[PDB]
Every structure is written in structure tokens, then in C-alpha cells.
Amino acid sequence: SHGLPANIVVQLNKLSGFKKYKVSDIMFFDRRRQTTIGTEDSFFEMVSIRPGGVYTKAQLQKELETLATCGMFEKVDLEGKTKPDGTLGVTISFAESTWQSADRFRCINVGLMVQSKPIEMDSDMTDKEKLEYYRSLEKDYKRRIDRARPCLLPAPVYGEVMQMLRDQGKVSARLLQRIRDRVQKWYHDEGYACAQVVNFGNLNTKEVVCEVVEGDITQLVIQFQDKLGNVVEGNTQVPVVRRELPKQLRQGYVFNIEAGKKALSNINSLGLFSNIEVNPRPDEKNEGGIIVEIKLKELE
């Protein structure tokens, strides 16, 4: 729905453009198995990018970042070949991370702390030096784990996730994919909308570390609108809205839609407003912090 190829069958890399490209077809390529992931494989849902969709340069970059930082691949690339008209196809290739069996499933809360970036360092990097380098990493990761917070995930889900490990016997990307959904299902079902599994740690032997951000609230925005939606100032009122927010909707708490509803129940009861919204949105830090946004249109 905008933009064009590099003319023509040349294969462009991820750096270009101020406009929204359209993608004719998506390919998901597995480097080690030398196969392609079918559109019905459901391992294809690792990709949020669908054919015929429109995405800016910034959006395709977040996709590559999400695939790279999740821990299921030690190499994952995103390339594209410009197609004659008027779109370009993309190829997401990858190499599954190297895994063993796992008898322990650990969940650590990385909300508000620094995210794991793949950060692959220099190769060769000699024999005895590389062997020390892994020990360097792992000692850092044990530091990161104990640095981290408890998660909210209740035991039975650990019980289920553990079984799936015993059932496969060896960790693959396909299994982590199921685990991430099962863990994420629980958070969302219980009302935590902004919770996500941001990574899978392999650095501890026979142990899967699941890093989640539960959606910690870092910010509160009260925005008055009218009429048809432009922002306007609410002067002397703004404190009277804040008292109607529950304790769990303020900063230092995990966002749950239950608190948004009670906030909505509270603010409604004042009888001052025609239109009221409570929506979370990610703040600019990308560490999992949440902005609580409240949109209001007055009566008078």
C-alpha cells in the first residue's frame, strides 16, 4: 500500500525507507534442517508478519529483534528479495539453539531490568580462552537469576510445563513455543494483559530458564478530550480522578485488567464524564514497564 522494489530481483537488506512496504509472501527458513516452514505448521506463528500486510522499516526491525532475543535461535536473520511489482518477499532464516534434556523449569521476573540480547562475542577466541568465556557468561547468568524477582506463575503450570519436557525429552524451538503459550495463557487468563515471555535461558545445564516481564506500571497518563477527540486541559479536576484509581493501578504494581475495571467503576460513579477509557500501553524503555492511560470526555 506504498513504496516499491529496488529494481528488481536484487536482494535488499534490512536498511532502507521512510514508507510502508507490502510483503507478498513470507518465508520461514530452517538453516540446519534445510527445510521451509509451511503456512499451516503453527510453528509459523513465531512470525507476526502475514502476506499482504503493510509494515514500516521500524516494524520489520522489531520482528527481527523479537525473534533474535527470545532464545530459540543462536542465529536468526531477516532478508528480502524485491519482487518485480510492486512488493518484496522476505526470508526469515534461523538455526535452533542447542539444547539437552531439562529436569528443571525456572521462571524469573526480569521486569524493569536489562533485557537479554543475544550478544554473540568474538569467535577464535582460542581454545582455552573460549572455554573460560562460557564460564564467564554462566556466572553472569546466575547473577542475573538471583537478581531477578519471583514470578506470579502458580505451581500447576510448572507441573504442566515440566511434563511437556519429560514427554519430548529434549528441548527444541517447537517445545519452547508451546511453553511460551502455556505460560502466557495463564498470565492473560488471570488478567495480566501486558505480561510476556521475553526470553528462554539455556545457560544453566538441564534447566530451562523462562524470563518474563509481568507488565510493571511505570507511568500514569490522564488525558481529557473533546469534542470528536482532541486533547484539552482539565484544569482543577485532575486530582479528583486520581483518587478514584485503586492502589494496584499506580506505579510499583503489576497491571491487571481488574484494577482498570474498578477504576472505571469508581470514576463512572462521579457522574462527571461522558466517555471513559483505561488502557495500558508500553512505555519507551522496552523493559516491560507499563503506562496506564486514562482517556476522558467531560459532560459540561
Coordinates of C-alpha atoms in Angstrom, one line a residue:
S1 CA 0.0 0.0 0.0
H2 CA 3.1 2.2 -0.6
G3 CA 6.7 2.0 -1.8
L4 CA 8.4 -0.2 -4.3
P5 CA 11.3 -2.7 -5.1
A6 CA 15.0 -1.9 -5.5
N7 CA 14.5 -2.8 -9.2
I8 CA 14.3 -5.6 -9.4
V9 CA 15.3 -9.1 -8.3
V10 CA 18.1 -7.7 -6.3
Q11 CA 18.0 -8.8 -2.7
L12 CA 17.9 -5.8 -0.3
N13 CA 18.9 -5.9 3.3
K14 CA 17.0 -4.5 6.3
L15 CA 18.4 -1.0 6.0
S16 CA 16.1 1.3 3.9
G17 CA 13.0 3.5 3.6
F18 CA 10.6 6.1 5.1
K19 CA 7.4 4.3 3.9
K20 CA 5.3 1.2 4.5
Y21 CA 6.2 -1.7 2.3
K22 CA 3.8 -4.5 1.5
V23 CA 5.0 -8.1 1.7
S24 CA 3.8 -10.6 -1.0
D25 CA 4.9 -13.8 0.8
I26 CA 6.8 -14.7 3.9
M27 CA 9.3 -17.5 4.1
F28 CA 10.5 -19.1 7.3
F29 CA 13.6 -21.0 6.6
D30 CA 15.4 -23.5 8.9
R31 CA 19.2 -23.5 8.2
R32 CA 20.1 -26.7 9.9
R33 CA 17.2 -28.9 8.6
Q34 CA 17.4 -27.1 5.2
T35 CA 13.6 -27.0 5.0
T36 CA 10.9 -24.4 4.9
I37 CA 8.1 -23.9 7.5
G38 CA 4.7 -24.3 5.9
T39 CA 1.9 -21.7 6.5
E40 CA -0.1 -24.3 8.4
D41 CA 2.8 -25.6 10.6
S42 CA 1.8 -23.4 13.6
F43 CA 5.5 -23.0 14.2
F44 CA 4.9 -20.3 11.6
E45 CA 3.2 -18.3 14.3
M46 CA 6.6 -17.4 15.5
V47 CA 6.2 -14.8 12.8
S48 CA 3.7 -11.9 13.4
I49 CA 4.2 -10.9 9.7
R50 CA 1.5 -12.1 7.3
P51 CA 1.4 -11.9 3.5
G52 CA -0.3 -8.8 2.0
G53 CA 0.4 -6.8 5.2
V54 CA 2.0 -3.4 5.4
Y55 CA 4.9 -2.7 7.7
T56 CA 7.4 0.2 8.1
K57 CA 11.1 -0.2 8.3
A58 CA 10.9 0.1 12.1
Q59 CA 8.3 -2.6 12.4
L60 CA 10.2 -5.3 10.5
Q61 CA 13.1 -4.5 12.7
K62 CA 11.2 -5.2 15.9
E63 CA 10.1 -8.5 14.4
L64 CA 13.8 -9.5 13.8
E65 CA 14.5 -8.3 17.3
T66 CA 11.7 -10.4 18.8
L67 CA 12.9 -13.5 17.0
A68 CA 16.5 -12.8 18.0
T69 CA 16.1 -12.1 21.7
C70 CA 13.6 -14.9 22.6
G71 CA 16.4 -17.5 22.9
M72 CA 15.2 -20.1 20.4
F73 CA 17.9 -19.4 17.8
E74 CA 21.6 -18.7 18.1
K75 CA 21.3 -17.2 14.6
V76 CA 18.2 -15.7 13.1
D77 CA 18.3 -13.4 10.1
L78 CA 15.7 -11.4 8.1
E79 CA 16.4 -10.7 4.5
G80 CA 14.3 -9.8 1.5
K81 CA 14.2 -10.0 -2.3
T82 CA 12.5 -7.2 -4.0
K83 CA 9.7 -8.6 -6.3
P84 CA 9.1 -7.0 -9.7
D85 CA 5.8 -5.4 -8.8
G86 CA 5.1 -3.9 -6.5
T87 CA 6.1 -5.7 -3.3
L88 CA 9.0 -7.6 -1.8
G89 CA 9.2 -11.1 -0.3
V90 CA 11.2 -11.7 2.9
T91 CA 13.1 -14.7 4.1
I92 CA 13.5 -15.3 7.8
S93 CA 16.1 -17.9 8.3
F94 CA 17.4 -19.4 11.6
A95 CA 19.3 -22.0 13.4
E96 CA 17.6 -23.6 16.5
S97 CA 19.5 -23.1 19.8
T98 CA 21.5 -26.1 21.0
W99 CA 19.7 -27.9 23.9
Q100 CA 19.8 -31.0 26.0
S101 CA 17.1 -32.6 28.2
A102 CA 15.8 -30.5 31.1
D103 CA 14.7 -31.6 34.6
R104 CA 14.1 -28.1 36.0
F105 CA 11.9 -25.2 34.7
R106 CA 12.8 -21.9 36.2
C107 CA 10.8 -18.7 35.8
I108 CA 12.4 -15.4 36.7
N109 CA 10.9 -11.9 36.6
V110 CA 13.1 -9.6 34.5
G111 CA 10.6 -6.8 34.6
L112 CA 12.3 -3.4 34.8
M113 CA 15.8 -4.9 34.5
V114 CA 18.0 -5.1 31.4
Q115 CA 16.9 -7.5 28.7
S116 CA 19.0 -10.3 27.3
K117 CA 20.4 -9.5 23.9
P118 CA 22.0 -12.5 22.1
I119 CA 25.3 -10.6 22.2
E120 CA 27.5 -13.2 20.4
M121 CA 31.1 -12.2 21.0
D122 CA 34.3 -12.8 19.0
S123 CA 35.0 -16.2 17.5
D124 CA 38.5 -17.6 17.7
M125 CA 38.8 -16.6 20.6
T126 CA 41.1 -19.5 21.1
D127 CA 40.6 -23.0 22.6
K128 CA 41.3 -22.5 26.3
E129 CA 40.1 -18.9 26.2
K130 CA 36.7 -19.8 24.8
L131 CA 36.3 -22.5 27.4
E132 CA 36.8 -19.8 30.1
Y133 CA 34.4 -17.5 28.2
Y134 CA 31.4 -19.8 28.7
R135 CA 32.2 -19.9 32.4
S136 CA 32.3 -16.0 32.3
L137 CA 28.8 -16.0 30.8
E138 CA 27.2 -18.5 33.1
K139 CA 28.5 -16.8 36.3
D140 CA 26.8 -13.7 35.0
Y141 CA 23.5 -15.5 34.3
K142 CA 23.4 -17.0 37.8
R143 CA 23.9 -13.4 39.0
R144 CA 21.0 -12.3 36.8
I145 CA 18.7 -15.1 38.0
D146 CA 19.2 -14.2 41.7
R147 CA 19.0 -10.5 40.7
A148 CA 15.5 -11.3 39.3
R149 CA 12.2 -11.2 41.1
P150 CA 9.7 -14.1 41.8
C151 CA 7.0 -14.6 39.1
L152 CA 3.3 -14.9 39.7
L153 CA 3.1 -18.3 37.9
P154 CA 1.4 -20.9 40.2
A155 CA 2.7 -24.4 40.7
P156 CA 0.3 -26.4 38.4
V157 CA 1.6 -24.6 35.3
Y158 CA 5.1 -25.7 36.4
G159 CA 3.6 -29.1 36.7
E160 CA 2.3 -29.0 33.1
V161 CA 5.4 -27.4 31.6
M162 CA 7.6 -30.0 33.3
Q163 CA 5.6 -32.8 31.9
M164 CA 6.0 -31.5 28.3
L165 CA 9.7 -31.7 28.9
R166 CA 9.6 -35.3 30.1
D167 CA 7.3 -36.0 27.1
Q168 CA 9.8 -34.7 24.5
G169 CA 12.9 -35.5 26.4
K170 CA 14.9 -32.8 24.5
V171 CA 14.3 -29.1 24.2
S172 CA 13.6 -27.8 20.7
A173 CA 12.2 -24.5 19.4
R174 CA 8.9 -26.2 18.8
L175 CA 8.6 -27.2 22.5
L176 CA 9.5 -23.7 23.8
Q177 CA 6.8 -22.4 21.6
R178 CA 4.2 -24.5 23.3
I179 CA 5.6 -23.5 26.7
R180 CA 5.5 -19.8 25.9
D181 CA 1.9 -20.0 25.0
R182 CA 1.0 -22.1 28.1
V183 CA 2.8 -19.7 30.4
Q184 CA 1.4 -16.7 28.5
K185 CA -2.1 -18.2 28.6
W186 CA -2.0 -18.3 32.3
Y187 CA -1.0 -14.6 32.8
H188 CA -3.6 -13.4 30.3
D189 CA -6.4 -15.6 31.7
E190 CA -5.8 -14.3 35.2
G191 CA -6.0 -10.7 34.0
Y192 CA -2.4 -9.7 33.3
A193 CA -2.7 -8.4 29.8
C194 CA 0.8 -6.9 29.4
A195 CA 2.7 -10.0 30.6
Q196 CA 5.1 -11.6 28.2
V197 CA 7.8 -14.2 27.9
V198 CA 10.7 -12.2 26.7
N199 CA 13.4 -14.9 26.7
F200 CA 14.4 -18.6 27.2
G201 CA 17.8 -19.1 29.0
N202 CA 19.8 -22.2 28.2
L203 CA 23.0 -21.3 30.2
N204 CA 22.2 -23.5 33.2
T205 CA 22.6 -27.2 32.4
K206 CA 19.4 -29.3 32.2
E207 CA 17.4 -26.3 33.2
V208 CA 15.1 -24.1 31.2
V209 CA 15.0 -20.5 32.4
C210 CA 11.9 -18.6 31.4
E211 CA 12.3 -14.8 31.6
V212 CA 9.0 -13.0 31.9
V213 CA 8.0 -9.3 32.2
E214 CA 4.7 -9.2 34.0
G215 CA 3.9 -5.6 32.9
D216 CA 5.0 -3.4 35.8
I217 CA 3.3 0.0 35.9
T218 CA 5.9 2.8 35.4
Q219 CA 3.6 5.7 34.4
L220 CA 0.1 7.3 34.6
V221 CA -1.5 9.5 32.0
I222 CA -4.8 11.3 32.4
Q223 CA -5.9 12.8 29.1
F224 CA -9.0 14.9 28.7
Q225 CA -10.7 15.0 25.2
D226 CA -13.5 16.9 23.3
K227 CA -15.4 17.1 21.0
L228 CA -14.7 14.3 18.4
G229 CA -11.4 13.7 20.3
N230 CA -8.9 16.5 20.5
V231 CA -6.9 16.9 23.8
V232 CA -7.9 19.7 26.1
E233 CA -6.9 20.6 29.7
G234 CA -9.0 19.5 32.7
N235 CA -7.7 22.2 35.0
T236 CA -8.7 21.9 38.6
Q237 CA -10.2 18.5 38.2
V238 CA -7.2 16.1 37.6
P239 CA -6.7 15.3 41.3
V240 CA -10.3 14.1 41.7
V241 CA -9.8 11.5 39.0
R242 CA -6.6 10.2 40.6
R243 CA -8.3 9.5 44.0
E244 CA -10.6 7.2 42.1
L245 CA -7.8 4.9 41.0
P246 CA -7.3 1.8 43.1
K247 CA -3.9 1.1 44.8
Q248 CA -2.9 -1.5 42.2
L249 CA -3.2 0.8 39.2
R250 CA -0.4 3.0 40.5
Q251 CA 3.3 2.7 39.8
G252 CA 5.1 -0.1 41.6
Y253 CA 2.4 -2.7 40.8
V254 CA 1.7 -5.3 38.1
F255 CA -1.1 -4.2 35.8
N256 CA -4.3 -6.3 35.9
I257 CA -7.5 -5.6 34.0
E258 CA -9.4 -6.0 37.2
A259 CA -7.9 -2.7 38.6
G260 CA -8.8 -0.9 35.3
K261 CA -12.4 -2.0 35.7
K262 CA -12.6 -0.9 39.3
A263 CA -11.0 2.3 38.3
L264 CA -13.7 2.6 35.6
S265 CA -16.3 1.7 38.2
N266 CA -15.0 4.3 40.6
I267 CA -14.6 7.1 38.0
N268 CA -18.1 6.5 36.5
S269 CA -19.7 6.9 39.9
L270 CA -18.7 10.6 40.0
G271 CA -21.1 11.3 37.2
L272 CA -18.8 13.9 35.7
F273 CA -17.8 12.1 32.4
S274 CA -19.5 11.0 29.1
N275 CA -16.7 8.7 27.9
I276 CA -14.0 6.9 29.9
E277 CA -11.2 4.6 29.0
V278 CA -8.5 2.7 30.9
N279 CA -5.8 1.3 28.6
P280 CA -2.2 0.1 29.2
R281 CA 0.5 0.8 26.7
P282 CA 4.2 0.0 26.7
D283 CA 6.5 2.8 27.8
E284 CA 9.5 3.8 25.8
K285 CA 12.0 1.7 27.9
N286 CA 11.0 -1.7 26.5
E287 CA 11.9 -3.3 29.8
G288 CA 8.3 -4.3 30.3
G289 CA 7.1 -1.2 32.0
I290 CA 3.5 0.0 31.5
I291 CA 1.8 3.3 31.1
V292 CA -1.7 3.5 32.5
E293 CA -3.6 5.7 30.1
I294 CA -7.0 7.2 31.1
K295 CA -8.9 8.9 28.3
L296 CA -11.8 11.2 29.4
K297 CA -14.5 13.3 27.7
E298 CA -16.5 15.6 30.0
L299 CA -20.2 16.2 30.2
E300 CA -20.4 20.0 30.6

